[PDB]
């Protein structure tokens, strides 16, 4: 297998195994571990390939990578969690039945 096939199989495992949180930060920390600095210039066509059956997430990943690149930390999964999980610090939800 190519290196990009292994990154793709590892992201589909993260996304298909979460419940009761959004998945975006764990996907970003996985890409930052796998690629480091090369994330700063990751294209939409490459992001869409790596997300596999979840390629709709690509707009949200590329924005989060732009907030890391425009705020100056080194590219490691520790520094990225300290920034992302720190910069947040909200939604009111209605129940909809089924007929």
């Amino acid at each position: 297998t190519y290196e990009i096939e292994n990154i793709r199989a590892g992201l589909e495992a993260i996304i298909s195994q979460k419940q009761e949180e959004d998945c975006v930060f764990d996907v970003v920390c996985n890409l930052v571990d796998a690629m480091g600095e090369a994330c700063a210039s990751l294209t939409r066509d490459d992001a869409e390939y790596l997300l596999g059956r979840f390629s709709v997430l690509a707009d949200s990943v590329l924005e989060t990578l732009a907030t890391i690149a425009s705020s100056g930390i080194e590219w490691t999964a520790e520094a990225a969690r300290d920034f992302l999980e720190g910069v947040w610090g909200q939604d009111n939800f209605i129940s909809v039945a089924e007929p």
Binding site: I15, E21, D22, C23, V24, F54, L57, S60, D91
Partner: peptide
């Protein structure tokens, strides 16, 4: 003005 992704 939500933080959530569309997929989630």
């Amino acid at each position: 003005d939500t933080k959530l992704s569309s997929l989630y």
